[PDB]
Design a protein around this ligand. Sequence first.
Ligand SMILES: C=C(C)[C@H]1Cc2c(ccc3c2O[C@@H]2COc4cc(OC)c(OC)cc4[C@@H]2C3=O)O1
Ligand code: SF4
Lengths: 82, 156, 110, 98, 114
Amino acid sequence: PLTLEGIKDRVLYVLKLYDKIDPEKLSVNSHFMKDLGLDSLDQVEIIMAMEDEFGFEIPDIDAEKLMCPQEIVDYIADKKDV
Amino acid sequence: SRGEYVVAKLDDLINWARRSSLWPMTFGLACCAVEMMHMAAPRYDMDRFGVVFRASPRQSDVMIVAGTLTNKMAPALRKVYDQMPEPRYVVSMGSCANGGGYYHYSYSVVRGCDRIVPVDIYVPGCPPTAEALLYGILQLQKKIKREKRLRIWYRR
Amino acid sequence: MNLMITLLTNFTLATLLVTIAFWLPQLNVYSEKTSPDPMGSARLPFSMKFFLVAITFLLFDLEIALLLPLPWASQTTNLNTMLTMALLLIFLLAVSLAYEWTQKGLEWTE
Amino acid sequence: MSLVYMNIMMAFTVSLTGLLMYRSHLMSSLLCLEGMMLSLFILATLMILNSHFTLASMMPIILLVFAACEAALGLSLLVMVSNTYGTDYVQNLNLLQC
Amino acid sequence: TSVKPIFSRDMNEAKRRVRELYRAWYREVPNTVHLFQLDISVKQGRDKVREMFKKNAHVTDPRVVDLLVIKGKMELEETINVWKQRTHVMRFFHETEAPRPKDFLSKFYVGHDP
Ligand SMILES: C=C(C)[C@H]1Cc2c(ccc3c2O[C@@H]2COc4cc(OC)c(OC)cc4[C@@H]2C3=O)O1
Ligand code: SF4
């Protein structure tokens, strides 16, 4: 929450705690639907795990457009300072 | 022998105390509760048999299922029955509590409260009269009169 | 001494009947049951008004504690002073009740 | 001197050390304060009766009345604290550190 | 074919309302396991919520999924408010119901239902 690299590593740590994802194919630009092969509800509970760890609410309209960890860390960085 | 005569007289004593101090809960459900009120009314008068209505089910001795049991209230009935200390008794009053009654084929009716609670006396009617409900209570008193608890405790 | 014997006997009879009530029907084994309320699980909210009527009881009980030696104080040789202070203490209990009245303290448990 | 006075003073100092060492609760602090008052009541009564000093027989009633009003004041302060924080825990009462 | 909508103009706003209902159920599962003191876990309850949401995953009508959202919110409010008992929550977990014969041969063995 202080530095951008810690926020990116914490995004990846929330994702690697999420046991459905294969951690081998996980990257920063990995796509949930076609690379990770995840359902939509899997992405929704990923967003709620991001709120469980990062502690700020995300509306539904700008959580549907977050299809990679890079978009998630860009949305976190846009709602914070870094 | 001596010990068997002792446990026989103690069985008669405790069964006398249990049959002559029945405390039912004031738990009505439907039309049968009106005739159960008439069995509390001055003519038939449960109170002269040692039979008083109590509001909390903790100080109650017999659960009179007087009325139709629905699906929405069957866990409430089972929880009320589970709040009773033992020995507790169940009297099923009327046709809907007995087997489902006039609403037997309904989507929302439990087809007899004996699917839920262990019924000891099945009092039949629609509603059974206050004289008939008091007959069922007297038959429950005869049933408690012939329980053999300490005889079986001695002979087990 | 006789008071202590009577207290001990009454306390002994109470504890004896409680022992009979918690161990003679607990000779039963009956059945291993589980047993799995208006408020369900939430915390009991504090009532300011029940606490205020308890404090009003405590303060009037202290005023009673001042009033209790009056049947002995009627025997005094300073009777004008005693009647003055007795009427003044009952008057102060009445003025405490009047201030509890007019400032809405006796409301919804009046 | 008299042996029972040692016990009443030691009960006063035990209730003191209970008050002078908080654990968690503020009600326990009020109970230690009123245990101090209780020991003071007993000790005053034993002195005033052993002296046959008649006029001070009204003094323990005055001690009891004034310190019960003091206890009611403290209970009201506790009630306002527990209305603010939900509990009467003393670790909630540290906003005046800064 | 021009009908009157319920809340959603098209399927995108419909999927938005479905997604917010799923967020509410996902947040509500651990509180439901605690305050009903269930013998299930949180992951198992969330898998049942996922199973009940994926049971209706094929509807492409806005009005039908709006009514599914409305009924899911009724289930939700009856779960948040303590109105259901333990039984009304455990009816989603058909535990006393024995697992039925699945293939052809076992249903042939046990009876006449296809
Ligand atoms: C307490 C005594 C002496 C009488 C009155 C009484 C009973 C037994 C049961 C009940 C009861 O009265 C209460 C209040 O009135 C009705 C009226 C009802 O219907 C008109 C009704 O239907 C289920 C239920 C009830 C209560 C009920 O369960 O015995
Ligand atoms: S058995 Fe009949 S008369 Fe009796 S409560 Fe049921 S519906 Fe009413």
